Design a protein around this ligand. Structure first.
Ligand code: NAP
Ligand code: MK4
Length: 316
């Protein structure tokens, strides 16, 4: 259905994927089912979403009934930063893999570069809500994750919310076995990530755009916050193609060869979001969209700036 972006490992990563963050239990199973029916093959998951067990349900159902084969699915999950200590990496992964009911993952990502206090309290924080650091680093984590690849439990590794400084630190680590195949970051016309995408691509690293629609149901949304889907200039380009603004926002990444993972649990929208291979944004339209950059982050759950490898301070 979707076209593909070739990874450094020669694996083919479907350029549109289904997001699952905040997809509720009792909706996410049906969401995944609808998505596979609509041609989605790439599903973006995480330990921290606490819904992997229902995603696994849906995947197994579709495989059994022959709607799809495992080899054609592309499943991604993520290691949460309270599990950067070596033995916890394995255990967190195992729970993810067991929840998803799979024999391997296509990509396993470091979810966030900063280590938090180790353990099963996922959001350790002080009274004021600032995150509590842990000693284990993302390099400690990467070491344990490389084993998973050695064992064939994960086909490739990647990173998420890394600046070019953290990737350089990864790439320059002596004794590295495996390199990251993607860096999953917020990306949309208000945060176009030009310098980061350029850097990543120069190093044979793809980019995966999260929150492409500006994540409109984030509860921390203040009414003065910019709304991509309601943006007049975005809607103007959509109208020109008789498409929706969401479709334009998704197609934007495709034309930059950037993988994109819109989240939805609404069947019509899930279908809508992958109907993006029958129109093309013009060079001028792409240029206009690129000019919307505000360096605005929707997903800045911060209060971790005080810890060492904070990614959002750097220029890119
Ligand atoms: N690695 C990371 O740190 C990180 C951070 C954030 C997100 N992510 C990943 O990226 C995915 C996508 O980002 P996101 O979930 O933050 O937000 P998003 O995909 O930008 O937007 C999701 C919201 O948009 C709505 N929506 C979806 N399609 C729509 C359409 N065609 N028209 C109007 N509204 C539509 C959804 O509503 P309904 O669901 O009610 O249909 C939902 O409220 C996540 O699910 C997650 O897998 C990763
Ligand atoms: O990754 C996501 O989909 C959204 O983020 C989260 C979702 C859950 Cl259910 C729990 C935690 C997070 C989260 O904070 N993830 C990463 C993160 C981001 Br995005 C931004 C900042 Br600032 C810090 C962190 Br940690």
């Amino acid at each position: 259905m979707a076209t593909f972006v070739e990874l450094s490992t020669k694996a083919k990563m479907p350029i549109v994927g289904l997001g699952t963050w905040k997809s509720p239990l009792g909706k996410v199973k049906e969401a995944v089912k609808v998505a596979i029916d609509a041609g989605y093959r790439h599903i973006d998951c995480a330990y921290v979403y606490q819904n992997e067990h229902e995603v696994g349900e849906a995947i197994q159902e579709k495989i059994q009934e022959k709607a799809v084969k495992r080899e054609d699915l592309f499943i991604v999950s993520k290691l949460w930063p309270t599990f950067f200590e070596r033995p916890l990496v394995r255990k967190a992964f195992e729970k993810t893999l067991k929840d998803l009911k799979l024999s391997y993952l296509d990509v396993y990502l470091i979810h966030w570069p900063q280590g938090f206090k180790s353990g099963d309290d996922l959001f350790p924080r002080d009274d004021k809500g600032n995150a509590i650091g842990g000693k284990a680093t993302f390099l400690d984590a990467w070491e344990a994750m490389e084993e998973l690849v050695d064992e064939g439990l994960v086909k490739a590794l990647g990173v998420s919310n890394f600046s070019h400084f953290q990737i350089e630190k990864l790439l320059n680590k002596p004794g590295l076995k495996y390199k990251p195949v993607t860096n999953q970051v917020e990306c949309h016309p208000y945060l176009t990530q030009e310098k980061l995408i350029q850097y990543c691509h120069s190093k044979g690293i793809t980019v995966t755009a999260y929150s492409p629609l500006g994540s409109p149901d984030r509860p921390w949304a203040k009414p003065e916050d910019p709304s991509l889907l309601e943006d007049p200039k975005i809607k103007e380009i959509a109208a020109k193609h008789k498409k929706t603004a969401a479709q334009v926002l998704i197609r934007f990444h495709i034309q930059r060869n950037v993988i994109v993972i819109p989240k939805s649990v609404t069947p019509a929208r899930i279908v809508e979001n992958i109907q993006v291979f029958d129109f093309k944004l013009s060079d001028e339209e792409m240029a206009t969209i690129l000019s919307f950059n505000r360096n605005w982050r929707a997903c800045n759950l911060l209060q971790s700036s005080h810890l060492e490898d904070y990614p959002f301070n750097a220029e890119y």
